[PDB]
Amino acid sequence: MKISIEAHIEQEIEAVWWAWNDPDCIARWNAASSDWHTTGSRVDLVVGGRFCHHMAAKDGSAGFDFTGTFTRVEAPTRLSFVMDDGREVDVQFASEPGGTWVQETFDAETSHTPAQQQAGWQGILDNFKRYVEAAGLEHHHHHH
């Protein structure tokens, strides 16, 4: 069973995919909670390559890591990957006159409540979108 969420980021699909795949960029977002922060992300972005998004707490009292394997990479318009939890996660980067329609579609983990997962993923997708807006990544500039 798949749950599909979305985001209309007013930015280029280049800057959005860049912020998504770049491990140094992922270091700031990914950890939705501000009490957490991604201390490292081993990203081998190829078809069959693995990812590992280590998140440390601000006081280092705990840690939490997102391991998995990319099952399909269609740069920059789509990224398909499965997590350690079994979540088949499919993030679509669609080009639109308004910016980039990032439609995330993940498989719901049988262990957790589906709606609570959707809230967690929408938190991380908000944290990503807000990172793109915070870092700027503004390709559009008024040339003069």
N, CA, C and O atoms as a DFTB+ gen file, in Angstrom:
576 C
 N C O
     1  1       0.855      -1.213       0.000
     2  2       0.000       0.000       0.000
     3  2       0.878       1.245       0.000
     4  3       1.761       1.387       0.845
     5  1       0.634       2.146      -0.948
     6  2       1.429       3.366      -1.125
     7  2       0.631       4.588      -0.649
     8  3      -0.561       4.706      -0.933
     9  1       1.299       5.494       0.075
    10  2       0.764       6.809       0.443
    11  2       1.531       7.875      -0.353
    12  3       2.761       7.910      -0.318
    13  1       0.805       8.740      -1.068
    14  2       1.404       9.742      -1.952
    15  2       1.128      11.156      -1.420
    16  3      -0.021      11.578      -1.295
    17  1       2.212      11.871      -1.112
    18  2       2.210      13.288      -0.733
    19  2       2.920      14.099      -1.829
    20  3       3.481      13.524      -2.762
    21  1       2.894      15.434      -1.713
    22  2       3.447      16.331      -2.745
    23  2       3.949      17.660      -2.149
    24  3       3.709      17.966      -0.981
    25  1       4.654      18.437      -2.993
    26  2       5.165      19.776      -2.666
    27  2       5.424      20.547      -3.963
    28  3       6.044      20.011      -4.881
    29  1       4.958      21.798      -4.050
    30  2       5.199      22.658      -5.221
    31  2       6.280      23.681      -4.854
    32  3       5.976      24.813      -4.478
    33  1       7.546      23.262      -4.969
    34  2       8.705      24.103      -4.629
    35  2       8.976      25.075      -5.785
    36  3       9.318      24.640      -6.884
    37  1       8.826      26.393      -5.549
    38  2       9.029      27.428      -6.587
    39  2      10.539      27.621      -6.832
    40  3      11.144      28.596      -6.385
    41  1      11.115      26.659      -7.553
    42  2      12.555      26.554      -7.801
    43  2      12.772      25.586      -8.972
    44  3      11.858      24.844      -9.331
    45  1      13.969      25.585      -9.569
    46  2      14.298      24.708     -10.703
    47  2      14.495      23.261     -10.233
    48  3      14.989      23.018      -9.132
    49  1      14.099      22.306     -11.085
    50  2      14.258      20.859     -10.838
    51  2      15.748      20.488     -10.618
    52  3      16.059      19.493      -9.964
    53  1      16.654      21.312     -11.178
    54  2      18.101      21.174     -10.984
    55  2      18.478      21.434      -9.517
    56  3      19.149      20.616      -8.888
    57  1      18.039      22.581      -8.981
    58  2      18.368      23.002      -7.599
    59  2      17.681      22.105      -6.553
    60  3      18.232      21.844      -5.484
    61  1      16.471      21.641      -6.888
    62  2      15.679      20.755      -6.018
    63  2      16.334      19.357      -5.931
    64  3      16.551      18.841      -4.836
    65  1      16.645      18.752      -7.098
    66  2      17.358      17.446      -7.159
    67  2      18.745      17.553      -6.506
    68  3      19.201      16.622      -5.843
    69  1      19.408      18.704      -6.704
    70  2      20.745      18.967      -6.148
    71  2      20.693      18.903      -4.613
    72  3      21.488      18.203      -3.986
    73  1      19.750      19.641      -4.025
    74  2      19.532      19.668      -2.569
    75  2      19.134      18.278      -2.028
    76  3      19.454      17.928      -0.892
    77  1      18.430      17.496      -2.869
    78  2      17.932      16.164      -2.491
    79  2      19.064      15.116      -2.438
    80  3      19.123      14.308      -1.510
    81  1      19.957      15.138      -3.440
    82  2      20.946      14.045      -3.657
    83  2      22.317      14.354      -3.021
    84  3      23.067      13.439      -2.682
    85  1      22.635      15.655      -2.864
    86  2      23.946      16.118      -2.354
    87  2      24.047      15.840      -0.838
    88  3      23.291      16.431      -0.067
    89  1      24.983      14.936      -0.386
    90  2      25.095      14.509       1.039
    91  2      25.295      15.671       2.036
    92  3      24.806      15.624       3.164
    93  1      26.024      16.714       1.592
    94  2      26.301      17.917       2.407
    95  2      25.011      18.716       2.621
    96  3      24.796      19.291       3.688
    97  1      24.158      18.742       1.595
    98  2      22.831      19.378       1.667
    99  2      21.890      18.588       2.590
   100  3      21.190      19.163       3.423
   101  1      21.889      17.249       2.420
   102  2      21.070      16.312       3.222
   103  2      21.432      16.401       4.712
   104  3      20.610      16.119       5.584
   105  1      22.685      16.801       4.980
   106  2      23.205      16.985       6.333
   107  2      22.383      18.007       7.157
   108  3      22.264      17.867       8.374
   109  1      21.820      19.032       6.485
   110  2      21.026      20.066       7.174
   111  2      19.567      19.597       7.361
   112  3      19.046      19.626       8.476
   113  1      18.906      19.163       6.255
   114  2      17.516      18.622       6.314
   115  2      17.547      17.104       6.677
   116  3      18.486      16.646       7.327
   117  1      16.509      16.331       6.251
   118  2      16.393      14.853       6.435
   119  2      15.890      14.523       7.853
   120  3      14.859      13.871       8.016
   121  1      16.627      14.979       8.867
   122  2      16.154      14.995      10.245
   123  2      15.103      16.104      10.377
   124  3      15.452      17.280      10.478
   125  1      13.805      15.728      10.375
   126  2      12.685      16.697      10.407
   127  2      12.774      17.604      11.654
   128  3      12.771      18.831      11.550
   129  1      12.852      16.961      12.830
   130  2      13.100      17.626      14.122
   131  2      14.402      18.471      14.095
   132  3      15.444      17.998      13.643
   133  1      14.320      19.724      14.586
   134  2      15.478      20.636      14.703
   135  2      16.410      20.204      15.857
   136  3      17.587      20.564      15.882
   137  1      15.856      19.423      16.812
   138  2      16.634      18.771      17.901
   139  2      17.524      17.644      17.352
   140  3      18.354      17.088      18.072
   141  1      17.338      17.320      16.068
   142  2      18.142      16.346      15.334
   143  2      18.771      17.049      14.125
   144  3      18.328      18.125      13.723
   145  1      19.804      16.430      13.555
   146  2      20.514      16.953      12.383
   147  2      21.323      15.810      11.769
   148  3      21.969      15.054      12.495
   149  1      21.295      15.676      10.442
   150  2      21.989      14.583       9.753
   151  2      23.519      14.837       9.781
   152  3      24.015      15.763       9.139
   153  1      24.246      13.996      10.536
   154  2      25.695      14.164      10.770
   155  2      26.523      13.550       9.622
   156  3      27.722      13.804       9.507
   157  1      25.863      12.742       8.780
   158  2      26.490      12.166       7.599
   159  2      25.480      11.460       6.714
   160  3      24.479      10.942       7.210
   161  1      25.729      11.432       5.396
   162  2      24.904      10.702       4.421
   163  2      25.800      10.066       3.351
   164  3      26.249      10.754       2.435
   165  1      26.065       8.748       3.461
   166  2      26.756       8.001       2.402
   167  2      25.760       7.748       1.268
   168  3      24.910       6.862       1.371
   169  1      25.866       8.527       0.187
   170  2      24.958       8.433      -0.965
   171  2      25.737       7.916      -2.179
   172  3      26.611       8.603      -2.708
   173  1      25.404       6.696      -2.608
   174  2      25.905       6.104      -3.857
   175  2      24.749       6.087      -4.854
   176  3      24.144       5.049      -5.122
   177  1      24.464       7.278      -5.395
   178  2      23.331       7.517      -6.291
   179  2      23.576       6.895      -7.679
   180  3      23.975       7.575      -8.625
   181  1      23.323       5.584      -7.761
   182  2      23.285       4.792      -8.999
   183  2      22.171       3.740      -8.854
   184  3      21.694       3.492      -7.746
   185  1      21.761       3.127      -9.970
   186  2      20.725       2.078      -9.957
   187  2      21.311       0.796      -9.321
   188  3      22.088       0.077      -9.949
   189  1      20.920       0.534      -8.066
   190  2      21.445      -0.582      -7.268
   191  2      22.432      -0.126      -6.192
   192  3      22.912      -0.935      -5.399
   193  1      22.732       1.186      -6.170
   194  2      23.602       1.787      -5.154
   195  2      22.886       2.005      -3.837
   196  3      21.658       2.091      -3.810
   197  1      23.637       2.098      -2.733
   198  2      23.055       2.231      -1.376
   199  2      23.165       3.666      -0.832
   200  3      24.002       4.454      -1.272
   201  1      22.288       3.980       0.144
   202  2      22.320       5.246       0.905
   203  2      22.283       4.966       2.414
   204  3      21.748       3.947       2.851
   205  1      22.863       5.890       3.205
   206  2      22.906       5.784       4.670
   207  2      22.918       7.190       5.304
   208  3      23.955       7.854       5.306
   209  1      21.768       7.648       5.843
   210  2      21.604       9.037       6.356
   211  2      21.617       9.043       7.891
   212  3      20.571       8.966       8.534
   213  1      22.824       9.135       8.460
   214  2      23.048       9.142       9.912
   215  2      22.616      10.486      10.499
   216  3      23.091      11.533      10.060
   217  1      21.716      10.464      11.490
   218  2      21.211      11.682      12.157
   219  2      21.604      11.647      13.632
   220  3      21.289      10.692      14.342
   221  1      22.289      12.688      14.085
   222  2      22.684      12.842      15.482
   223  2      21.778      13.873      16.155
   224  3      21.361      14.846      15.528
   225  1      21.478      13.650      17.436
   226  2      20.805      14.644      18.273
   227  2      21.798      15.760      18.650
   228  3      23.010      15.545      18.631
   229  1      21.279      16.949      18.990
   230  2      22.109      18.147      19.285
   231  2      23.007      17.972      20.528
   232  3      24.073      18.581      20.620
   233  1      22.566      17.137      21.474
   234  2      23.324      16.856      22.711
   235  2      24.025      15.493      22.604
   236  3      24.747      15.086      23.515
   237  1      23.803      14.788      21.472
   238  2      24.399      13.471      21.219
   239  2      23.930      12.392      22.194
   240  3      24.641      11.416      22.435
   241  1      22.723      12.573      22.758
   242  2      22.130      11.603      23.702
   243  2      21.569      10.380      22.946
   244  3      21.418       9.302      23.520
   245  1      21.264      10.569      21.650
   246  2      20.749       9.508      20.772
   247  2      21.150       9.759      19.309
   248  3      21.602      10.844      18.941
   249  1      20.965       8.714      18.495
   250  2      21.195       8.746      17.055
   251  2      20.157       7.900      16.339
   252  3      19.506       7.059      16.959
   253  1      19.995       8.119      15.030
   254  2      19.000       7.415      14.203
   255  2      19.421       7.541      12.730
   256  3      19.726       8.640      12.268
   257  1      19.439       6.426      11.997
   258  2      20.064       6.340      10.662
   259  2      19.080       5.746       9.637
   260  3      18.320       4.831       9.954
   261  1      19.106       6.283       8.402
   262  2      18.241       5.843       7.285
   263  2      19.078       5.127       6.208
   264  3      19.553       5.753       5.261
   265  1      19.248       3.810       6.371
   266  2      19.911       2.951       5.374
   267  2      18.902       2.446       4.329
   268  3      17.697       2.411       4.578
   269  1      19.420       2.058       3.159
   270  2      18.608       1.484       2.098
   271  2      19.387       1.343       0.804
   272  3      20.610       1.487       0.784
   273  1      18.663       1.056      -0.289
   274  2      19.243       0.880      -1.627
   275  2      18.353       1.547      -2.693
   276  3      17.150       1.295      -2.755
   277  1      18.967       2.402      -3.532
   278  2      18.338       2.962      -4.738
   279  2      18.023       1.825      -5.723
   280  3      18.927       1.113      -6.161
   281  1      16.746       1.661      -6.065
   282  2      16.284       0.602      -6.977
   283  2      16.218       1.113      -8.426
   284  3      16.259       0.329      -9.374
   285  1      16.115       2.439      -8.577
   286  2      16.003       3.119      -9.879
   287  2      16.360       4.598      -9.696
   288  3      15.901       5.231      -8.745
   289  1      17.175       5.150     -10.602
   290  2      17.558       6.573     -10.579
   291  2      17.289       7.164     -11.963
   292  3      17.940       6.789     -12.938
   293  1      16.328       8.088     -12.049
   294  2      16.014       8.803     -13.294
   295  2      16.239      10.308     -13.066
   296  3      15.291      11.064     -12.856
   297  1      17.512      10.723     -13.111
   298  2      17.929      12.087     -12.775
   299  2      17.557      13.075     -13.904
   300  3      17.748      12.743     -15.074
   301  1      17.024      14.299     -13.584
   302  2      16.663      14.744     -12.222
   303  2      15.150      14.600     -11.912
   304  3      14.661      15.166     -10.934
   305  1      14.423      13.840     -12.751
   306  2      12.947      13.858     -12.784
   307  2      12.286      12.827     -11.841
   308  3      11.073      12.877     -11.633
   309  1      13.069      11.899     -11.276
   310  2      12.547      10.813     -10.418
   311  2      13.685      10.072      -9.700
   312  3      14.775       9.901     -10.247
   313  1      13.407       9.637      -8.463
   314  2      14.302       8.796      -7.678
   315  2      13.481       7.729      -6.954
   316  3      12.577       8.047      -6.181
   317  1      13.806       6.468      -7.211
   318  2      13.123       5.318      -6.621
   319  2      14.129       4.532      -5.763
   320  3      15.228       4.217      -6.220
   321  1      13.746       4.220      -4.527
   322  2      14.613       3.544      -3.564
   323  2      13.782       2.871      -2.481
   324  3      12.670       3.308      -2.186
   325  1      14.321       1.804      -1.888
   326  2      13.688       1.094      -0.769
   327  2      14.520       1.358       0.487
   328  3      15.748       1.400       0.429
   329  1      13.840       1.533       1.620
   330  2      14.483       1.764       2.919
   331  2      14.729       0.430       3.627
   332  3      14.282      -0.619       3.163
   333  1      15.446       0.482       4.756
   334  2      15.734      -0.707       5.594
   335  2      14.443      -1.309       6.174
   336  3      14.368      -2.507       6.446
   337  1      13.429      -0.448       6.355
   338  2      12.130      -0.821       6.946
   339  2      11.259      -1.573       5.916
   340  3      10.220      -2.137       6.259
   341  1      11.710      -1.566       4.643
   342  2      10.985      -2.172       3.529
   343  2      10.177      -1.159       2.733
   344  3       9.583      -1.504       1.711
   345  1      10.149       0.109       3.200
   346  2       9.361       1.184       2.562
   347  2       9.873       1.431       1.139
   348  3      10.965       1.967       0.952
   349  1       9.078       1.038       0.137
   350  2       9.377       1.327      -1.264
   351  2       8.982       2.795      -1.539
   352  3       7.807       3.118      -1.712
   353  1       9.994       3.660      -1.572
   354  2       9.863       5.131      -1.583
   355  2      10.207       5.687      -2.975
   356  3      11.299       5.448      -3.490
   357  1       9.275       6.422      -3.573
   358  2       9.371       6.903      -4.955
   359  2       9.073       8.405      -5.000
   360  3       7.926       8.831      -4.867
   361  1      10.129       9.190      -5.191
   362  2      10.085      10.651      -5.173
   363  2      10.169      11.173      -6.614
   364  3      11.188      11.001      -7.282
   365  1       9.100      11.806      -7.080
   366  2       8.998      12.337      -8.445
   367  2       9.276      13.836      -8.417
   368  3       8.669      14.566      -7.634
   369  1      10.189      14.293      -9.266
   370  2      10.501      15.715      -9.445
   371  2       9.966      16.146     -10.820
   372  3      10.614      15.925     -11.842
   373  1       8.784      16.759     -10.830
   374  2       8.093      17.152     -12.065
   375  2       8.299      18.644     -12.326
   376  3       8.166      19.458     -11.412
   377  1       8.623      19.003     -13.569
   378  2       8.783      20.401     -13.970
   379  2       7.413      21.030     -14.276
   380  3       6.616      20.476     -15.033
   381  1       7.163      22.196     -13.670
   382  2       5.897      22.932     -13.782
   383  2       6.192      24.434     -13.923
   384  3       7.215      24.896     -13.417
   385  1       5.308      25.224     -14.608
   386  2       5.443      26.703     -14.693
   387  2       5.582      27.422     -13.321
   388  3       6.083      28.545     -13.255
   389  1       5.132      26.758     -12.235
   390  2       5.229      27.299     -10.868
   391  2       6.531      26.957     -10.146
   392  3       6.882      27.612      -9.165
   393  1       7.253      25.935     -10.621
   394  2       8.503      25.495      -9.991
   395  2       8.764      24.013     -10.232
   396  3       9.022      23.600     -11.363
   397  1       8.696      23.207      -9.159
   398  2       8.935      21.754      -9.199
   399  2       7.896      21.047      -8.322
   400  3       7.853      21.250      -7.109
   401  1       7.061      20.215      -8.952
   402  2       6.110      19.361      -8.255
   403  2       6.821      18.086      -7.782
   404  3       6.949      17.113      -8.525
   405  1       7.274      18.121      -6.535
   406  2       7.903      16.987      -5.880
   407  2       6.807      16.134      -5.237
   408  3       6.333      16.433      -4.141
   409  1       6.414      15.065      -5.941
   410  2       5.381      14.142      -5.484
   411  2       6.071      12.904      -4.923
   412  3       6.579      12.071      -5.674
   413  1       6.083      12.793      -3.604
   414  2       6.694      11.669      -2.899
   415  2       5.604      10.586      -2.719
   416  3       4.470      10.910      -2.365
   417  1       5.939       9.319      -2.959
   418  2       5.022       8.183      -2.821
   419  2       5.781       7.030      -2.172
   420  3       6.640       6.425      -2.813
   421  1       5.480       6.713      -0.911
   422  2       6.218       5.691      -0.142
   423  2       5.277       4.531       0.191
   424  3       4.066       4.731       0.290
   425  1       5.822       3.316       0.365
   426  2       5.028       2.175       0.858
   427  2       4.920       2.277       2.381
   428  3       5.915       2.501       3.070
   429  1       3.698       2.109       2.898
   430  2       3.416       2.241       4.321
   431  2       3.962       1.024       5.080
   432  3       3.655      -0.120       4.746
   433  1       4.771       1.293       6.099
   434  2       5.375       0.263       6.934
   435  2       4.293      -0.383       7.819
   436  3       3.611       0.307       8.577
   437  1       4.147      -1.712       7.711
   438  2       3.147      -2.500       8.474
   439  2       3.264      -2.309      10.010
   440  3       2.290      -2.503      10.737
   441  1       4.461      -1.930      10.486
   442  2       4.741      -1.773      11.921
   443  2       4.133      -0.466      12.487
   444  3       3.629      -0.452      13.610
   445  1       4.186       0.627      11.699
   446  2       3.704       1.964      12.140
   447  2       2.312       2.271      11.559
   448  3       1.898       1.670      10.568
   449  1       1.597       3.220      12.197
   450  2       0.283       3.688      11.728
   451  2       0.466       4.565      10.460
   452  3       1.178       5.568      10.514
   453  1      -0.183       4.188       9.298
   454  2       0.015       4.848       7.970
   455  2      -0.026       6.400       7.985
   456  3       0.831       7.047       7.384
   457  1      -1.023       6.983       8.672
   458  2      -1.197       8.458       8.754
   459  2      -0.022       9.139       9.493
   460  3       0.410      10.226       9.109
   461  1       0.486       8.488      10.553
   462  2       1.630       9.007      11.340
   463  2       2.923       9.006      10.509
   464  3       3.780       9.875      10.668
   465  1       3.042       8.009       9.621
   466  2       4.158       7.925       8.671
   467  2       4.089       9.103       7.700
   468  3       5.089       9.774       7.443
   469  1       2.878       9.343       7.161
   470  2       2.586      10.454       6.232
   471  2       2.980      11.812       6.852
   472  3       3.470      12.703       6.158
   473  1       2.755      11.946       8.170
   474  2       3.117      13.153       8.941
   475  2       4.643      13.296       9.067
   476  3       5.187      14.395       8.964
   477  1       5.320      12.156       9.293
   478  2       6.784      12.112       9.383
   479  2       7.453      12.483       8.063
   480  3       8.405      13.263       8.032
   481  1       6.938      11.909       6.973
   482  2       7.444      12.141       5.613
   483  2       7.138      13.560       5.140
   484  3       7.958      14.177       4.460
   485  1       5.957      14.082       5.497
   486  2       5.561      15.466       5.165
   487  2       6.384      16.467       5.997
   488  3       6.619      17.597       5.568
   489  1       6.816      16.034       7.192
   490  2       7.736      16.807       8.028
   491  2       9.118      16.928       7.392
   492  3       9.718      18.003       7.380
   493  1       9.617      15.800       6.859
   494  2      10.935      15.723       6.188
   495  2      10.900      16.410       4.804
   496  3      11.892      16.995       4.370
   497  1       9.747      16.329       4.126
   498  2       9.532      16.950       2.800
   499  2       9.378      18.471       2.956
   500  3       9.838      19.241       2.114
   501  1       8.719      18.890       4.055
   502  2       8.637      20.310       4.471
   503  2      10.026      20.816       4.843
   504  3      10.392      21.942       4.508
   505  1      10.802      19.976       5.541
   506  2      12.152      20.335       6.023
   507  2      13.121      20.469       4.837
   508  3      14.055      21.270       4.860
   509  1      12.864      19.657       3.800
   510  2      13.592      19.692       2.530
   511  2      13.232      20.959       1.734
   512  3      14.112      21.713       1.319
   513  1      11.928      21.177       1.531
   514  2      11.385      22.315       0.754
   515  2      11.842      23.647       1.361
   516  3      12.281      24.559       0.660
   517  1      11.721      23.719       2.684
   518  2      12.141      24.867       3.500
   519  2      13.666      25.050       3.451
   520  3      14.153      26.179       3.516
   521  1      14.426      23.939       3.337
   522  2      15.887      23.997       3.107
   523  2      16.197      24.639       1.743
   524  3      17.087      25.483       1.644
   525  1      15.464      24.237       0.697
   526  2      15.642      24.786      -0.664
   527  2      15.374      26.309      -0.655
   528  3      16.084      27.078      -1.304
   529  1      14.335      26.722       0.094
   530  2      13.936      28.137       0.242
   531  2      14.916      28.920       1.157
   532  3      15.103      30.125       0.982
   533  1      15.534      28.221       2.129
   534  2      16.423      28.841       3.150
   535  2      17.807      29.091       2.545
   536  3      18.355      30.191       2.614
   537  1      18.347      28.023       1.949
   538  2      19.598      28.044       1.166
   539  2      19.440      28.902      -0.101
   540  3      20.423      29.330      -0.705
   541  1      18.177      29.141      -0.485
   542  2      17.849      29.924      -1.661
   543  2      17.899      29.076      -2.906
   544  3      16.865      28.684      -3.446
   545  1      19.134      28.785      -3.372
   546  2      19.398      28.002      -4.603
   547  2      18.799      28.707      -5.846
   548  3      18.554      28.085      -6.879
   549  1      18.575      30.035      -5.697
   550  2      17.897      30.882      -6.685
   551  2      18.680      30.906      -7.999
   552  3      19.727      31.547      -8.096
   553  1      18.161      30.200      -9.007
   554  2      18.711      30.221     -10.369
   555  2      18.131      31.427     -11.115
   556  3      18.828      32.100     -11.874
   557  1      16.826      31.686     -10.878
   558  2      16.127      32.875     -11.387
   559  2      16.662      34.141     -10.726
   560  3      16.566      34.317      -9.511
   561  1      17.225      35.015     -11.551
   562  2      17.660      36.346     -11.158
   563  2      17.286      37.312     -12.274
   564  3      17.370      36.975     -13.455
   565  1      16.872      38.517     -11.887
   566  2      16.565      39.588     -12.834
   567  2      17.877      40.105     -13.455
   568  3      18.583      40.911     -12.849
   569  1      18.188      39.626     -14.671
   570  2      19.387      40.042     -15.409
   571  2      19.248      41.510     -15.835
   572  3      18.258      41.901     -16.453
   573  1      20.258      42.309     -15.492
   574  2      20.332      43.730     -15.833
   575  2      21.818      44.092     -16.064
   576  3      22.133      45.243     -16.365
